[PDB]
Design an enzyme around this catalytic site. Structure first.
Site, PDB file in Angstrom:
ATOM      1  N   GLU A 194       0.862  -1.205   0.000  1.00  0.00           N
ATOM      2  CA  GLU A 194       0.000   0.000   0.000  1.00  0.00           C
ATOM      3  C   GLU A 194       0.888   1.242   0.000  1.00  0.00           C
ATOM      4  O   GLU A 194       0.502   2.186  -0.686  1.00  0.00           O
ATOM      5  CB  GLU A 194      -1.007   0.000   1.150  1.00  0.00           C
ATOM      6  CG  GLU A 194      -2.078  -1.048   1.010  1.00  0.00           C
ATOM      7  CD  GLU A 194      -3.175  -0.715   0.024  1.00  0.00           C
ATOM      8  OE1 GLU A 194      -4.056  -1.564  -0.197  1.00  0.00           O
ATOM      9  OE2 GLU A 194      -3.151   0.405  -0.483  1.00  0.00           O
ATOM     10  N   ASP A 215      -6.392   8.772   0.324  1.00  0.00           N
ATOM     11  CA  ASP A 215      -5.858   7.612   1.087  1.00  0.00           C
ATOM     12  C   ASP A 215      -4.710   8.129   1.966  1.00  0.00           C
ATOM     13  O   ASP A 215      -3.865   8.904   1.434  1.00  0.00           O
ATOM     14  CB  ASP A 215      -5.491   6.514   0.089  1.00  0.00           C
ATOM     15  CG  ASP A 215      -6.683   6.009  -0.706  1.00  0.00           C
ATOM     16  OD1 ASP A 215      -7.759   5.843  -0.087  1.00  0.00           O
ATOM     17  OD2 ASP A 215      -6.543   5.802  -1.934  1.00  0.00           O
TER      18      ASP A 215
END
Length: 133
Positions: A35, A52
């Site tokens: 990620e 995010d």
């Protein structure tokens, strides 16, 4: 400079400070690698007007931030973008808890795109071997 963990450094932190199980650790290390490259200040501004945040790239549409979408983790998104991962971890465990709730037993990590492509059904004991061996 924002904190960027080594993989084994991140593994040892989850064990030493948070007493996480090996199952939890191998899954969180894998998710963090793919990620964010274990970069606590990683941030991605999407086309859908959402963002995010941090090492677990948690999305402000559902999980953090009073001002945008919902705030299930009841936290400002900035708190998920910190040298200290306490709130990132607390909120990731809530994302895992809720996802499992709706999706079914053992499907908690399927909330992460990196989990679905890079970590699900892998031998994460092999993956962790360079840290645990």
């Amino acid at each position: 400079d924002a904190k960027v963990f080594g993989k084994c450094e991140f593994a040892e932190l989850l064990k030493r400070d948070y007493y996480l199980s090996n199952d939890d650790i191998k899954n969180w290390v894998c998710i963090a690698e793919f990620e964010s490259s274990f970069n606590t200040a990683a941030i991605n501004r999407n086309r859908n007007r959402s963002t995010d945040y941090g090492i677990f790239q948690i999305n402000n549409k559902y999980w953090c931030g009073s001002d945008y979408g919902k705030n299930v983790c009841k936290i400002p998104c900035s708190d998920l973008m910190s040298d200290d991962i306490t709130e990132a971890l607390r909120c990731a465990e809530t994302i895992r808890r809720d996802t499992e709730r709706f999706r079914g037993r053992g499907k908690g990590y399927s909330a992460w795109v990196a989990y679905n492509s890079k970590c699900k059904n892998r031998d994460l004991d092999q993956y962790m071997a360079e840290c645990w061996s």
